[PDB]
Ligand SMILES: O=C(O)[C@@H](O)[C@@H](O)[C@H](O)[C@@H](O)COP(=O)(O)O
Ligand SMILES: O=C(O)[C@@H](O)[C@@H](O)[C@H](O)[C@@H](O)COP(=O)(O)O
Ligand SMILES: [Mg+2]
């Protein structure tokens with residue numbers, strides 16, 4: 001079954017705790033959004049893991065360069081997974097993975113923005129086993145919706161051997177679109193953080209997921 | 214015009230960054246809060262440094278990839294002068310960051326680290342972006358990738374496109390002559406200045422060399 005991941009795109013830790021104190025036990029993965037990494041620094045990862053050690057903590061650092069330096073900082077802060085932006089040099093993705101192996105963590109390729117299938121092949125050959133298919137937030141606000149092109153690419157990535165995470169302003173009604181595909185993880189940020197009842201929002205995703213998968 | 218000198222502070226903590234700034238703040242033109250420092254300390258790095266050097270241009274190398282209006286605003290509210298947007302970012306992300314930049318009389322730079330296309334370069338121009346950072350990846354450098362004709366060609370073409378170009382990537386004094394004849398806007402030095410026996414003398418040697426090759 002696809003796991004449920006909550007994106008913490010808050011600017012301060014106290015803001016993030018308003019959400020985790022409610023749904024921490026309702027999700028599988030607690031992500032330190034890029035906005036939180038830049039707002040508080042890597043201490044966000046260290047503090048959240050200390051609070052929820054039984055959960056998977058993802059540092060959405062979107063590493064672009066200095067792969068072994070930035071990943072080591074996240075894993076030393078106890079992160080389980082870290083993200084590497086899709087346009088990073090292949091040596092950058094490789095370095096982060098090498099470090100991740102030292103901590104028994106893992107690396108994800110953030111497919112935010114422009115990327116190609118040739119790069120996708122390179123990531124496989126490098127040994128990367130996870131990708132995050134992301135519909136850009138700025139793109140969404142510009143009227144961009146989910147479509148067949150996305151479904152097709154997602155299926156293709158899956159056929160390549162990647163464990164695929166789908167994210168990007170996902171609402172409970174968007175789940176049916178991905179039925180049939182073995183999605184590894186579904187990410188929900190605003191739809192859970194900003195719902196009237198975050199707990200009900202989280203449980204409904206879980207419910208819908210178990211029902212469709 | 215003479216290319217300016219910018220020091221990249223890719224430190225993990227503020228105190229480590231200050232060991233350098235207390236020495237060369239007045240020897241360089243632009244003080245950069247490297248990505249590593251941002252992730253290490255958070256946006257407070259930008260605010261503290263600007264309060265220390267208000268007369269200097271402070272760049273936040275945030276490498277914005279999405280949520281361009283939110284992240285840029287965070288950096289600008291912390292008093293950054295310039296912010297960087299990673300090259301693969303959706304064009305709307307770059308536009309949104311630029312829109313916020315105008316509100317704070319700041320500016321945006323497209324960070325050319327990794328894979329990008331000329332078609333994308335045209336879009337940045339159309340969007341009104343005036344600065345790009347040609348970067349030779351640090352991980353590629355360690356992999357044995359040196360500065361070559363391929364880079365010079367691209368840099369020249371970006372310059373002809375109307376972009377003010379910044380060059381960076383493990384630059385050493387020996388590499389500067391490779392860019393002679395090109396109207397480079399800024400030369401960024403990180404390790405070559407932070408790790409020298411005498412950072413002050415390292416910074417001055419870069420300046421002297423720049424004045425000699427571009428004067
Ligand atoms: O670009 C970013 O860093 C976020 O906008 C993005 O990764 C975000 O964390 C999404 O993955 C989940 O958040 P939403 O469901 O609210 O889009
Ligand atoms: O990718 C990064 O964040 C840095 O590795 C990179 O931007 C760095 O700041 C260089 O631009 C300057 O540093 P060096 O001269 O040491 O390569
Ligand atoms: Mg995220």
Ligand SMILES: [Mg+2]
Nearest residue numbers: 221247248274
């Ligand atoms: Mg930098």
